[PDB]
Design a protein around this ligand. Sequence first.
Ligand SMILES: [Mg+2]
Ligand SMILES: [Zn+2]
Ligand SMILES: [Zn+2]
Ligand SMILES: [Zn+2]
Lengths: 98, 65, 98, 144, 379, 255, 44, 98, 35, 115, 77, 48, 240
Amino acid sequence: FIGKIPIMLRSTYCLLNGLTDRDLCELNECPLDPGGYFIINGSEKVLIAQEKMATNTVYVFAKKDSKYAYTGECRSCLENSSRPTSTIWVSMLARGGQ
Amino acid sequence: MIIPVRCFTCGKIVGNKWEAYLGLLQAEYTEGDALDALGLKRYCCRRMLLAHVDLIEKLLNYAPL
Amino acid sequence: DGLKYSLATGNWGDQKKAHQARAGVSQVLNRLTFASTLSHLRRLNSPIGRDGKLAKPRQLHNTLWGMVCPAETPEGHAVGLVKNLALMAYISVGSQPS
Amino acid sequence: KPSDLHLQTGYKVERHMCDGDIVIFNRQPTLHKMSMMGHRVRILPWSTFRLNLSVTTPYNADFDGDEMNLHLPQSLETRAEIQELAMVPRMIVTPQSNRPVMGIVQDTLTAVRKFTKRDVFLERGEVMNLLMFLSTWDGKVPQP
Amino acid sequence: VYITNFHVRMDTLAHVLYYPQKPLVTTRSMEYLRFRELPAGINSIVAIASYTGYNQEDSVIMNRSAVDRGFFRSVFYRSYKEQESKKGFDQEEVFEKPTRETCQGMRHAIYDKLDDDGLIAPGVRVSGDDVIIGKTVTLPTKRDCSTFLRTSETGIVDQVMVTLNQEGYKFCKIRVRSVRIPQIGDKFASRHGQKGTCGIQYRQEDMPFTCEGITPDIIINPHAIPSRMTIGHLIECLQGKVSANKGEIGDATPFNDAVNVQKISNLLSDYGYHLRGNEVLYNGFTGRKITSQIFIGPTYYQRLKHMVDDKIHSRARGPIQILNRQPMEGRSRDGGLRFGEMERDCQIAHGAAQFLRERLFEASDPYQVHVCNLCGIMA
Amino acid sequence: PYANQPTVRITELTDENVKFIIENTDLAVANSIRRVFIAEVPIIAIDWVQIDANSSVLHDEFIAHRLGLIPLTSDDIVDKLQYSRDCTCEEFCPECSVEFTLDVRCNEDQTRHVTSRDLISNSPRVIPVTSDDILIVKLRKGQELRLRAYAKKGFGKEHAKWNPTAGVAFEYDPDNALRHTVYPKPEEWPKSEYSELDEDESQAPYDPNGKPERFYYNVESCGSLRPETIVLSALSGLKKKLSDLQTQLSHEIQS
Amino acid sequence: MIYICGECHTENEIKSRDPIRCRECGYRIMYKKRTKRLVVFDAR
Amino acid sequence: RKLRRQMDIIVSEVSMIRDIREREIRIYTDAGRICRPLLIVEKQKLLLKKRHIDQLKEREYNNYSWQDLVASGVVEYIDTLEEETVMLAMTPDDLQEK
Amino acid sequence: DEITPDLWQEACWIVISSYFDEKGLVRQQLDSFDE
Amino acid sequence: MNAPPAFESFLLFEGEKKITINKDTKVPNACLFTINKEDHTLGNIIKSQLLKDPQVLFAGYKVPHPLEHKIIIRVQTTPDYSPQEAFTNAITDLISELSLLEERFRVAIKDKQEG
Amino acid sequence: KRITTPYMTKYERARVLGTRALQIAMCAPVMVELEGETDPLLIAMKELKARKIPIIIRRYLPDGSYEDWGVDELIIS
Amino acid sequence: SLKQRLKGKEGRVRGNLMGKRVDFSARTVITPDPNLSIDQVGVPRSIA
Amino acid sequence: TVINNWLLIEGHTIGIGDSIADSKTYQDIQNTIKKAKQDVIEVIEKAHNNELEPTPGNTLRQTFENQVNRILNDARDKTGSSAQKSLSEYNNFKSMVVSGAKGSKINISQVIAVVGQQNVEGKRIPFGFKHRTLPHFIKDDYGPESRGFVENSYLAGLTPTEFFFHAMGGREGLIDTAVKTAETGYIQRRLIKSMESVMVKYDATVRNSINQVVQLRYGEDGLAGESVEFQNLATLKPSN
RNA sequence: CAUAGUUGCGCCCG
Ligand SMILES: [Mg+2]
Ligand SMILES: [Zn+2]
Ligand SMILES: [Zn+2]
Ligand SMILES: [Zn+2]
């Protein structure tokens, strides 16, 4: 034993998985309840999807807050390993310097 | 929930008609003809049986107390 | 406890580094109407971050067609940031490229 | 104990607010003098604040969900100050643009546009019913 | 009805409508939201017309008789909770109805409604100050730490459950039921953003009425529409009229050219009505025909969670703060109102210096100190 | 300087509704009459619901509200019954109220429909009107409902449960001869069932001398009272109101 | 006080000194029995 | 495209974006991408035929589900990145008419 | 053979009904957690 | 919370007069009848009957507030016919009309039931 | 050397009415005739119209000096 | 910190001296009423 | 009070019939839109054949989009004018607009005839995709429909593309209200604290808390803003 | 009459 993982309701390992509406009525569970949330200390907690820039991809932008004409960046990260996502910039300096 | 006793707007009794209205639906009437068969001529009363949702039947699936 | 604490508080990262952690990830599920619950479950959050100060994402971009609700945002200081999925919107669960 | 209820001159009674007491009324955000104005209180038997419709426009108020704040002056000096400075009739003309701040509003404005059309005509019963609501009427029914 | 098993569940806040209805004018997509089986709102005969003047500025006149018939009546459920525990061994709180002399101080609220366990049994009227959980912490006699209700609530204890907590302590949750009837100030909305408050409630005879004896349930202000341009509202009203006469739930899928206002008008005209939905109505007070005719018909309205009892409050010499000597919100909203800097400078613009002094100092936190004239420091 | 000589012609009479016409009368009189129909006709409706026990899926005051809206056959009993606030007793007696009892125990697998049939009065001359039958609630196996209640005199002004009419259709000048209303395009408007115009016509020719008369009525009873009895009770009640007002005015003038 | 088990609906008296548990089911959620005090609702 | 529509090696939600002008073929199999179903068009004609609708009319007691529609190569998932390389008819009844 | 333009109005909603019967409206959370 | 007692829109209070008379100083032979716990049901009909009287120079009524249950009826007359006299005559005429109407209605009920 | 306006300012009217009403509320003697008056504000208004309030306004000029005006010395706005 | 007790818009200055909570103050929802003069406000009985 | 009590006798309402126009009006609107879209196609042809010459101070793209913008603007204005001339004397939209109590002429033209061009940051809808506003259009399409010209009224209902572009415009309006509420009062609270103490002293001079003269007389005349009003000087304009 | 932390994150209303 190493610990306890909260289980999303109606997920493949939730006890309400696969049961018919008669069973859910027997278990005092609404058959129309969509599920997809956890119960933490009796509070129904739902996780919001978080939007972020996609990884491992070349993006050329125009940094106006710098001395660079353009910056090519790429947030590089492995498949489900090394959570630190190493971001690289390859940047063309401004030509206006003189 | 359950059918209202009276039509909210006019007060016509529409509580003794929900079960009969479903019985007529089993007899394969149109919804309009079923309501006309029950004498609901004002569309205030027709609103009830046509738009009512009967959730009490669902709540009678759970166990008592 | 750790997972529980995060799902209790919505603070994500080290518990000790919760001062600098991202917050507002996990939320108490909104149970006032069934449609409200489904809207909360199908909700997406775009953080401000360093990207936010560069380009304004509050506007409804064209690539939001058919993937996210064109008119559903919380009015106030979260217009455009908090969004809700289109009805036939499915998120890729990922797979091995091998 | 009636001695504790007995009164003499110089004593003070914190009486419940009754009709005629002056109250300051405002809505947040406050943007000008007309957003915080004095009114006279009227007891009404339900659970909201009431307004004549015209004073909604200086407050920038509408009855979708707006709630407003009411303060009660506690001294006769403050009450007189609100009476002589902050009452809405004194605040009709705003010095921001030397204009009236409040005017006729939606239903009244359309209804009076209809009313003052050249082809409006009122029989005896209608005019006699209408003149009941004219407070500053001397009681002379005019020559038709 | 937010969920089917709401009766078993005990959430912190819930609202349930007495008589929900699936909308007469629906969309195909609504079949798969399961909104047809868990509706939120009622179809109501709405007449779009100016009247005595209580509907103006996005307000609503309601049929008092309809509300007497259960129109938009709802229940608001609270679920309080409290847990017994043992902190060390110097104390152990315990559920039991306290007594005046067994405890070293209690509030004037009556404790003779609980049982021996100190929990009120379900089915008893409670007030905004009665005691629901008689809990007493032992003094290292004892000190009462019982719980009361919100000051602005008067319901009935619906369901009292007792459990062992995660650690193994007898703890209880208590549902309290309060029946909310629509009243003046309650917020209602269409499915088109026409948010409005209940201006006033008229009985059925005072309301206007058609030749058929039909009164309207709700009377909006027509001036809501031109600036907003919510023409889906009007088309919904027309389509609902057609649906209710025809006996068929009308389809309002947006991008469907099979339905346009022309066909709806032709179908409406087939039932002996004005093809554009207008009708001649009679003044409820005088019985006179109204000079103009009134657009009217069924439309799906929905009562929002906001009520005046939730928002109404007033402060007069209540529980000031322990640090700033200023009002704070305790058991309720009863912490006065922040006299913000905007209001301060507004009063300065008014020139009402005495009232401003009264607000900021003489009626907020008046204090006095003693200062030595020689140095200048408070002594 | 005197009131008209109004005449009545009854076009139709059922146990559900009465349709008739009043002529030689003023608009205000007719409108006040339909106001009295809706609001000021006294009937007997359930009030004071005391619930001994409840195991329904519905909370208690839900059931009390539903029982309040049950109509009761109160044809002639209502005359001899006094208002409870006017009666002198320990708050309830046969001269101000009628007792009702209900006790249903569903220990059966089938759903038990608690209807108006199950309501039991102590006085047989007051019954539920439908006694199809009005559904009150549905009970599961092992679920019961036991309560008693009373029913007392009152009129629709106090609460709509005392409203005896299920809609009072009212009309006058069906051809718009007075032009009290102005159709922007009268061609569009369907004719009334009391209209007498032809098909080419859409309005009667305007009369600058007409007055509202020939008011068409259709009082549809909810079922509590016979509609004939509704109209008779309404006229008697309004007569009583004006006579009492005259008595108070006589006191005021004498003072 | 009397309590009703949340699983098998067993009526049973439980003192306020012991852990709460149904006396032949082992279940650990109770419900207080309805009060026997008189209650009146106006039908309005 | 044939393999994904047949679901032989490539599972659906795997996005294949060809930038013709840049001569790039980006294949994406990671999680987090957002996709939706779309009906496939060929020779200005739908691959959806009346027989599929007939089999879906008796969706019960025949067990022809949406998964068979995807497996038969009639409807396929498309993400925002792929949508740039899609000429998407609004509706078949008018757009692909002659 | 081919869906007629008039019958297409029924056909698309039959397809969408089959889709939601297969999937439901919370496939995101459930599938993500299962993965 | 602040909902009024619903049974108090028709029922009087202690020392509350159902009707009071006040002479109106603006115009001679003009008086205001303030009637408590009454709606338009009496004000409109009494105003209509008063207007039919030829000696009534002016007759009107108003509700000062719909949430309140007062009605103010202003009656002004030629200077030979008191406003109280006009009010009494109007009520007597309405009572006679309602009695006649009830009698004719009962006769019509009997005729329709038999025929 | 009186340079302030003889017209009483609105602020001066407000303050003098409030202060005199507070005085009358403390049973100050009334320097005007009153009939059936209980609200001190109305009594103060009547005394103001009669110009019999026993108060002198001291207007501080910005230099530091001042003028003194009786309420009767000032023209009522 | 001590310095944080004053700075911002919620300290003892800008949060408690340029504005603060005040007694004898109520708030609630507004509704229209044409039968009141502009200088009049209806109030609930409970607040009064 | 008087106008409300009369309005009970009169009554006022808005309905569908107030939004419907005659068939000839719809036909005129359709002719106008056909002609305008043909003109836009002609302008695109001139741009494609490189025979559109830029106006000065404007590049060729700017001149092209200005031509298209003015074409669509005058099309909307003509359609709205024709719709307004069609309004009956009983059309209650015209009642509410003529009174000025609510709405405006542009609202009537939008609901009856044409919603018009939807703009983002004062520009037509940009190519969020590669040279496309949506996946329903060929690349490099500057037509009104592809560039976000809603050509159906609210009564007629918007097509999906038109609906999405209108949603984008509404989103811009909402963000504008958001930043307005953000900057609501910050400027004002700065101004008020800079000028809190500036008052009029009893010498009729305007001074600050420092007692420094800012104006010898308030507003250079010593007159309040409550009594002044507009007049015209008759000895300025006329000839000698 | 008198007694019930902050200090933040989130969220609801205008
Ligand atoms: Mg608002
Ligand atoms: Zn009805
Ligand atoms: Zn009795
Ligand atoms: Zn058990």
